Each structure stands twice: as structure tokens, then as C-alpha cells.
PDB file of C-alpha atoms in Angstrom:
ATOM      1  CA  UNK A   1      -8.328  15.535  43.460  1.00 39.53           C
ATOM      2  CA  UNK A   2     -11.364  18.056  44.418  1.00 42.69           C
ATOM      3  CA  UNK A   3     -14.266  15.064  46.088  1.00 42.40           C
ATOM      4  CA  UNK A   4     -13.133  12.492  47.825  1.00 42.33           C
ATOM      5  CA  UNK A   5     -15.868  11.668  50.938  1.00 42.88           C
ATOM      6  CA  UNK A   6     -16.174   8.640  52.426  1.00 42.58           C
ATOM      7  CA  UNK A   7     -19.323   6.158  51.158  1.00 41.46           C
ATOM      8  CA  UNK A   8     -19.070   3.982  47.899  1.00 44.54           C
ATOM      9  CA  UNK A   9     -22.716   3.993  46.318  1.00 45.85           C
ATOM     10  CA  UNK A  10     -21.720   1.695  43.010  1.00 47.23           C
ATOM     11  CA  UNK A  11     -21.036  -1.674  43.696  1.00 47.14           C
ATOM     12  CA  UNK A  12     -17.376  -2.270  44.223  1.00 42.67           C
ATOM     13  CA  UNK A  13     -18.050  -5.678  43.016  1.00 42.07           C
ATOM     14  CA  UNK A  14     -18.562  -4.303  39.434  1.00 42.19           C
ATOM     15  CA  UNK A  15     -14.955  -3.765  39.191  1.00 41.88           C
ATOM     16  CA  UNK A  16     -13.480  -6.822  41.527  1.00 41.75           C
ATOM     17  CA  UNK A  17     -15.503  -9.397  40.618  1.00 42.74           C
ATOM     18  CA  UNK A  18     -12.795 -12.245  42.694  1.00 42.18           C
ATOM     19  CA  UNK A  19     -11.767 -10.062  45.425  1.00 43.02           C
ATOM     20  CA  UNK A  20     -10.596 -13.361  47.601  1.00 39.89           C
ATOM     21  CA  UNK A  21      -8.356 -14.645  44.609  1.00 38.63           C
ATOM     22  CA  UNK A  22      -7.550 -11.067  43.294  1.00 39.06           C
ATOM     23  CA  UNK A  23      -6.291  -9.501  46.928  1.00 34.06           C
ATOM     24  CA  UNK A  24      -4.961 -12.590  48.203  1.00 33.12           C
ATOM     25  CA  UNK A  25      -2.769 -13.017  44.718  1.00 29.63           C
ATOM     26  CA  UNK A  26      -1.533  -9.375  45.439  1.00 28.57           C
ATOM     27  CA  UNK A  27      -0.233  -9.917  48.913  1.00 30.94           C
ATOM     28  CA  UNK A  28       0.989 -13.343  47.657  1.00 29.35           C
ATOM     29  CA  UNK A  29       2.983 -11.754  45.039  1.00 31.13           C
ATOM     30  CA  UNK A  30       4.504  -9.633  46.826  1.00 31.95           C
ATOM     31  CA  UNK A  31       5.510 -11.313  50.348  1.00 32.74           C
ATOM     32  CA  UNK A  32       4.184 -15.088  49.869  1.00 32.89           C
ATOM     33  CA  UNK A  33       0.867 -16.839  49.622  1.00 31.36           C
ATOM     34  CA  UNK A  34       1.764 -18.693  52.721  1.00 33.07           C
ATOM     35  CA  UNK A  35       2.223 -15.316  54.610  1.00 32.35           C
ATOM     36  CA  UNK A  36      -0.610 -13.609  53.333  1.00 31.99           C
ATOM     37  CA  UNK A  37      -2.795 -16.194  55.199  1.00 33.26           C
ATOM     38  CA  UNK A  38      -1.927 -14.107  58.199  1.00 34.62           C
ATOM     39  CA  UNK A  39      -1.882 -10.525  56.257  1.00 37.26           C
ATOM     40  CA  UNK A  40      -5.429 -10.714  55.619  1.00 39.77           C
ATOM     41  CA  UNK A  41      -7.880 -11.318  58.570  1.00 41.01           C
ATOM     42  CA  UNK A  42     -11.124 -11.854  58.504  1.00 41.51           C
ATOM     43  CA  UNK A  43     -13.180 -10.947  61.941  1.00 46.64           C
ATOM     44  CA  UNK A  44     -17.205 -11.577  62.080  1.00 46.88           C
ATOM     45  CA  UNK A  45     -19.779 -10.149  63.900  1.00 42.98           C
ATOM     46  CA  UNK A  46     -23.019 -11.131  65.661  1.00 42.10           C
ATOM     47  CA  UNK A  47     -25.753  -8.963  66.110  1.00 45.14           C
ATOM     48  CA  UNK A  48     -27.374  -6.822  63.407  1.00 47.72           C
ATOM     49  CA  UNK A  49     -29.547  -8.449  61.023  1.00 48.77           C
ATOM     50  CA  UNK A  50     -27.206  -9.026  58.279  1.00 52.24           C
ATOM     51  CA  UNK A  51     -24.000 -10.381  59.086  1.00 53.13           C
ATOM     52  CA  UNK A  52     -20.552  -8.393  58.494  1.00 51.70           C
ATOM     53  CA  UNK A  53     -16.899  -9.053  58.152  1.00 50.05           C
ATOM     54  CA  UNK A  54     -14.036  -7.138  58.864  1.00 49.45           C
ATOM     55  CA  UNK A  55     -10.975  -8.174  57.215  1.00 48.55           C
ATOM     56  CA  UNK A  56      -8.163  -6.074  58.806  1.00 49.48           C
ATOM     57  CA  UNK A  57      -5.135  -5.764  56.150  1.00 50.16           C
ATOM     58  CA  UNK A  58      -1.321  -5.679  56.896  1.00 49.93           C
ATOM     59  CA  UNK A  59       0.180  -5.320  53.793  1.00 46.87           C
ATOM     60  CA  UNK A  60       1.268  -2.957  52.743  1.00 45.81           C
ATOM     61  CA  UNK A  61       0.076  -0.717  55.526  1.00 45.70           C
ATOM     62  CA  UNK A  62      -1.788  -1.824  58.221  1.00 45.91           C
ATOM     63  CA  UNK A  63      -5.519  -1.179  57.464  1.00 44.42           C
ATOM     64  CA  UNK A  64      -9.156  -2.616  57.755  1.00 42.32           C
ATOM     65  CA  UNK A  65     -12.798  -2.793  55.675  1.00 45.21           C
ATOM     66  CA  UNK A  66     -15.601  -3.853  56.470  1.00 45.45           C
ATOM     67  CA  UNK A  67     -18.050  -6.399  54.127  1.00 44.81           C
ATOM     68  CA  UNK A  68     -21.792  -6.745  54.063  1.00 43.39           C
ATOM     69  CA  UNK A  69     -23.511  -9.905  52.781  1.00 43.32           C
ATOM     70  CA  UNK A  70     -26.400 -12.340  53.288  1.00 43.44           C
ATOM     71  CA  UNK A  71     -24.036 -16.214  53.692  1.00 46.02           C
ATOM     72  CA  UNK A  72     -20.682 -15.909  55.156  1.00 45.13           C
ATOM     73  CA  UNK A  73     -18.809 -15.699  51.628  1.00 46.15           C
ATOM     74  CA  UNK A  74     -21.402 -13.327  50.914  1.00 45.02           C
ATOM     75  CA  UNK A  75     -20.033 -10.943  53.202  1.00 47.98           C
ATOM     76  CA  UNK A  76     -16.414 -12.228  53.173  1.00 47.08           C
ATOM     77  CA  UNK A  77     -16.339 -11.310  49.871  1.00 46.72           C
ATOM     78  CA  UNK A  78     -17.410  -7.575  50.138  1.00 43.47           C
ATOM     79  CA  UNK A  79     -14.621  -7.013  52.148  1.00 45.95           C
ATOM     80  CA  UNK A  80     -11.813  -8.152  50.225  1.00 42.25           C
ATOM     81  CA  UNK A  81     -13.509  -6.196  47.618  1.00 46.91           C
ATOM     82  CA  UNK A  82     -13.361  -2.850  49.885  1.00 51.07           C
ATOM     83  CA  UNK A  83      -9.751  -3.400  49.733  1.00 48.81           C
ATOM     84  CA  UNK A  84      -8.817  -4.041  46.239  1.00 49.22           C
ATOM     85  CA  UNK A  85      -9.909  -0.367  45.472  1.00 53.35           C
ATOM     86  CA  UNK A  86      -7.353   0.648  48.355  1.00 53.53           C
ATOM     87  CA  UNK A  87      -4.236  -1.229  46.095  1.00 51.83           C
ATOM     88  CA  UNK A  88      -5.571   0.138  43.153  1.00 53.87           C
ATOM     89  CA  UNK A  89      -5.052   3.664  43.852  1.00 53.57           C
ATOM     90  CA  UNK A  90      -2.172   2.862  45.614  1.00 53.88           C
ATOM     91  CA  UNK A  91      -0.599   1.489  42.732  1.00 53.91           C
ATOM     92  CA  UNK A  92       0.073  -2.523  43.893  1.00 53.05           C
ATOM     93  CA  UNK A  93      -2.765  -3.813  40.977  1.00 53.45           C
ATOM     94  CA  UNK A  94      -2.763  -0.984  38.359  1.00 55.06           C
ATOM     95  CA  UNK A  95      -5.608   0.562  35.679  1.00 55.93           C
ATOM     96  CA  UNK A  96      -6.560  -3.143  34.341  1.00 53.25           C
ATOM     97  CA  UNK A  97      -5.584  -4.818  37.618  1.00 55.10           C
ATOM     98  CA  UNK A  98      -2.034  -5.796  36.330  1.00 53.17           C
ATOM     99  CA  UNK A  99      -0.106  -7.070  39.623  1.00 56.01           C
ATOM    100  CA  UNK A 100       3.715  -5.752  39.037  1.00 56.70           C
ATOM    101  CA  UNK A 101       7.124  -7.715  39.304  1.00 54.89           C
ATOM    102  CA  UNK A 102       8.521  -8.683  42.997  1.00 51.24           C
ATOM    103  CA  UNK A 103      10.915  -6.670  43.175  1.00 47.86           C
ATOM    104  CA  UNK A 104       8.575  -4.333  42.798  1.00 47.31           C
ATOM    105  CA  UNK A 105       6.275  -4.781  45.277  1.00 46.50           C
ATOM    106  CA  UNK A 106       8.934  -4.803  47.598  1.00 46.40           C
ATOM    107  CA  UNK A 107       9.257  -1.326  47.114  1.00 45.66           C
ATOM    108  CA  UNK A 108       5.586  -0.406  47.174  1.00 45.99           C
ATOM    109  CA  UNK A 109       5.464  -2.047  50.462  1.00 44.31           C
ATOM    110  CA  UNK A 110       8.668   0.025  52.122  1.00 42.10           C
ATOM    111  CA  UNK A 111       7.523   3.565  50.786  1.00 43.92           C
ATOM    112  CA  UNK A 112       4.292   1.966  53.342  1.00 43.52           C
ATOM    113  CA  UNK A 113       6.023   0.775  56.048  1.00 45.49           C
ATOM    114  CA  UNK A 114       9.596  -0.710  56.965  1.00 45.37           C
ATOM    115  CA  UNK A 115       9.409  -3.641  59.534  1.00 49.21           C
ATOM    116  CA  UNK A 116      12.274  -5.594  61.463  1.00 48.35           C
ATOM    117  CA  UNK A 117      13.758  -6.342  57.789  1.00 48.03           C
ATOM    118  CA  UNK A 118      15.963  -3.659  56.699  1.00 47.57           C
ATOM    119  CA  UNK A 119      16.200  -4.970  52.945  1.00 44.86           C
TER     120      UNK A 119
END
């Protein structure tokens, strides 16, 4: 790829319209709804006018976005949405957001990262 700088100016949204079912699904998929609970954290803030979210990722890598919004799932939502572009490219959802097999996504996670589990 020639660009890629950092700053999204269309609306991520657009594209994941039910980033809190869509991620979580992902991540539930691969490792286990129950365990995603803990995968994806949300962290918010106090102080500017609008409030914000962090939601620092795990799986596969460990990673973090941040989401803007006006109510709680307002901004919530953003961030989950930040991500879902991340497992797009990376190839965990697909060109029509088509999660993959298990077994799969045990892979996708080890190219990432290989914790205590050796497979």
C-alpha cells in the first residue's frame, strides 16, 4: 500500500453498524464468549466535554482504540467499532464480515501471539 496515515474521516460506523455484537462474536468464536468478557476492556474517562472509552483488545494481539460519543453506549460503541476495521484487515472477519471456522482462528491468533498454551 502507498497512504496509510493515521485519522479515519468517514464514519467507521458506516461499515460496523453492531460493533459490540460483531467484535465480541469474533473473539467469541475464536477463544469463547465467556473469555472474551475479559479480552475486551472497556476503560472511561472524565474530563473533556464529551466522554470517551478506551477498550483495550487482547485478542489476537494485544491492542487498544479509543471511542467518542455523547451517552455511555454512545461512546462504547465507537470503540468496538475502531477495532473491527483492525480484524478486518487482519483477516479474522473478511470482505463481507464473514467470521471463519475455529480452527481457524486458532491460527490467526498464533501467527499474533503464542501464550502459555503451546497448541
Amino acid at each position: 500500500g502507498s497512504s496509510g496515515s493515521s485519522g479515519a474521516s468517514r464514519d467507521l460506523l458506516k461499515e460496523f453498524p453492531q460493533p459490540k455484537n460483531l467484535l465480541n462474536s469474533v473473539i467469541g468464536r475464536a477463544l469463547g464468549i465467556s473469555h472474551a468478557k475479559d479480552k475486551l476492556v472497556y476503560v472511561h474517562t472524565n474530563g473533556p466535554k464529551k466522554k470517551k472509552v478506551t477498550l483495550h483488545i487482547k485478542w489476537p494481539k494485544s491492542v487498544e482504540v479509543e471511542g467518542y460519543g455523547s451517552k455511555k453506549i454512545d461512546a462504547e460503541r465507537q470503540a468496538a467499532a475502531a477495532a473491527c476495521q483492525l480484524f478486518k484487515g487482519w483477516g479474522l472477519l473478511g470482505p463481507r464480515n464473514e467470521l471463519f471456522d475455529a480452527a481457524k482462528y486458532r491460527v490467526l491468533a498464533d501467527r499474533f501471539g503464542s501464550g502459555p498454551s503451546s497448541g
